[PDB]
Design an enzyme around this catalytic site. Structure first.
Site, PDB file in Angstrom:
ATOM      1  N   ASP A 181       0.847  -1.220   0.000  1.00  0.00           N
ATOM      2  CA  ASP A 181       0.000   0.000   0.000  1.00  0.00           C
ATOM      3  C   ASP A 181       0.877   1.262   0.000  1.00  0.00           C
ATOM      4  O   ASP A 181       0.512   2.220  -0.715  1.00  0.00           O
ATOM      5  CB  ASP A 181      -0.999   0.018   1.182  1.00  0.00           C
ATOM      6  N   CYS A 215      -2.005   0.341 -13.603  1.00  0.00           N
ATOM      7  CA  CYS A 215      -2.155   0.355 -12.116  1.00  0.00           C
ATOM      8  C   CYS A 215      -3.376   1.222 -11.810  1.00  0.00           C
ATOM      9  O   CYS A 215      -4.344   1.100 -12.566  1.00  0.00           O
ATOM     10  CB  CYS A 215      -0.833   0.716 -11.444  1.00  0.00           C
ATOM     11  N   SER A 216      -3.359   2.144 -10.849  1.00  0.00           N
ATOM     12  CA  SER A 216      -4.504   3.084 -10.720  1.00  0.00           C
ATOM     13  C   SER A 216      -4.409   4.214 -11.757  1.00  0.00           C
ATOM     14  O   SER A 216      -5.393   4.397 -12.528  1.00  0.00           O
ATOM     15  CB  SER A 216      -4.626   3.629  -9.299  1.00  0.00           C
ATOM     16  N   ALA A 217      -3.258   4.918 -11.816  1.00  0.00           N
ATOM     17  CA  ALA A 217      -3.072   6.034 -12.799  1.00  0.00           C
ATOM     18  C   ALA A 217      -2.418   5.563 -14.109  1.00  0.00           C
ATOM     19  O   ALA A 217      -2.580   6.276 -15.159  1.00  0.00           O
ATOM     20  CB  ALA A 217      -2.269   7.156 -12.170  1.00  0.00           C
ATOM     21  N   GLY A 218      -1.767   4.393 -14.111  1.00  0.00           N
ATOM     22  CA  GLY A 218      -0.996   3.878 -15.276  1.00  0.00           C
ATOM     23  C   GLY A 218       0.280   4.669 -15.556  1.00  0.00           C
ATOM     24  O   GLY A 218       0.655   4.762 -16.738  1.00  0.00           O
ATOM     25  N   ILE A 219       0.964   5.169 -14.528  1.00  0.00           N
ATOM     26  CA  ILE A 219       2.283   5.842 -14.768  1.00  0.00           C
ATOM     27  C   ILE A 219       3.357   5.353 -13.810  1.00  0.00           C
ATOM     28  O   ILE A 219       4.530   5.355 -14.184  1.00  0.00           O
ATOM     29  CB  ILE A 219       2.115   7.378 -14.750  1.00  0.00           C
ATOM     30  N   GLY A 220       3.033   4.960 -12.573  1.00  0.00           N
ATOM     31  CA  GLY A 220       4.067   4.658 -11.576  1.00  0.00           C
ATOM     32  C   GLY A 220       4.537   3.227 -11.583  1.00  0.00           C
ATOM     33  O   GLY A 220       5.609   2.956 -12.150  1.00  0.00           O
ATOM     34  N   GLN A 262       6.776   7.611 -10.494  1.00  0.00           N
ATOM     35  CA  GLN A 262       6.071   8.708  -9.749  1.00  0.00           C
ATOM     36  C   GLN A 262       6.862   9.223  -8.536  1.00  0.00           C
ATOM     37  O   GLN A 262       6.511  10.345  -8.035  1.00  0.00           O
ATOM     38  CB  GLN A 262       4.708   8.201  -9.266  1.00  0.00           C
TER      39      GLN A 262
END
Ligand SMILES: CN1C[C@@H]2CN3C(=O)CCN3[C@@H]2c2ccccc21
Length: 282
Positions: A181, A215-220, A262
């Site tokens: 998390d 992922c959630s945003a698709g960058i990290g 990120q």
């Protein structure tokens, strides 16, 4: 400069934050005008994470062709990836339309549906064989065929049917279920094992459309997956594997989607993954 020595030099100096901000400063800035149109507000999870116009994936429809998704095309490595946000309640039908239209074999998921007590993406695949999902807006049917639950990841076989033509295809769902998390994993061993399972499936190979990674945003987390895969492939292909410059590969990838990696801790983890993966192979 051998990255393993660059690594020890940054760690002993504690300069990860300084390296990371240098990347943020040199990164590409291209327009995202389609993402910001008022008609697309409910198709975006995060106001500050948008696909560039030049590299966005277009849906094959006349109504509205917009999805929050980018094509990352790595010319020297001969790999392509689609990086996308976690699907939203109003975009699960668009998501599977994209997988169908782009001829993808594999979907790579690096988050849980709930993390930190909040919803990070829609429940976009069926959990039981006998309870299939129908997406009425895009005319697709999705069925769970089998599920293999392991300690660090789950692999699912899914059947996607185009209800317009009655063609079907097998899609593989690779779900990394143990990213913490907060922060990054302490060892990259389980993440590299997972990368090697996706590779072994054929999902990253040129006989298929690009893998879809989110992922959630698709960058990290998504950024870490494609960065480690491309850097290891370049170390296999070149005469001098020590010439591979992880910071330069990341800046090339940021030409195609903003914000990849990120945090300074994700940048350090990406170095650790490539250093350990290289030694496993070389
Ligand atoms: C078959 N199916 C799945 C889609 C996916 N979906 C979400 O993820 C949010 C709600 N919505 C749909 C929905 C709604 C009501 C009854 C069935 C279904």
């Amino acid at each position: 400069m051998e990255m393993e020595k660059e690594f020890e030099q940054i760690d002993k100096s504690g300069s990860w934050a300084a390296i990371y901000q240098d990347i943020r400063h040199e990164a590409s800035d291209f327009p995202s005008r389609v993402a910001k149109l008022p008609k697309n507000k409910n198709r975006n999870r995060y106001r500050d994470v948008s696909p560039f116009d030049h590299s966005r994936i277009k849906l094959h429809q006349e109504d509205n062709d917009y999805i929050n998704a980018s094509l990352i095309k790595m010319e020297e490595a001969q790999r392509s990836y689609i990086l996308t946000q976690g699907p939203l309640p109003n975009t699960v039908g668009h998501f599977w339309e994209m997988v169908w239209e782009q001829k993808s074999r594999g979907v790579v998921m690096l988050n849980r549906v709930m993390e930190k007590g909040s919803l990070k993406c829609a429940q976009y695949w069926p959990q039981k064989e006998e309870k299939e999902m129908i997406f009425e807006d895009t005319n697709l049917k999705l069925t769970l065929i089998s599920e293999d639950i392991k300690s660090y990841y789950t692999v699912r076989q899914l059947e996607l049917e185009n209800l317009t033509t009655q063609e079907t295809r097998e899609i593989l769902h690779f779900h990394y279920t143990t990213w913490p998390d907060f922060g990054v994993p302490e060892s990259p061993a389980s993440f590299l094992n997972f990368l090697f399972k996706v590779r072994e499936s054929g999902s990253l190979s040129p006989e298929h459309g690009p893998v879809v990674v989110h992922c959630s945003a698709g960058i990290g987390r998504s950024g870490t997956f494609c960065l480690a895969d491309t850097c290891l492939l370049l170390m296999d292909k070149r005469k001098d594997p020590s010439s591979v410059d992880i910071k330069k590969v990341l800046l090339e990838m940021r030409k195609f989607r903003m914000g990849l990696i990120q945090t300074a801790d994700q940048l350090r983890f990406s170095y650790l993954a490539v250093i350990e993966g290289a030694k496993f192979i070389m």
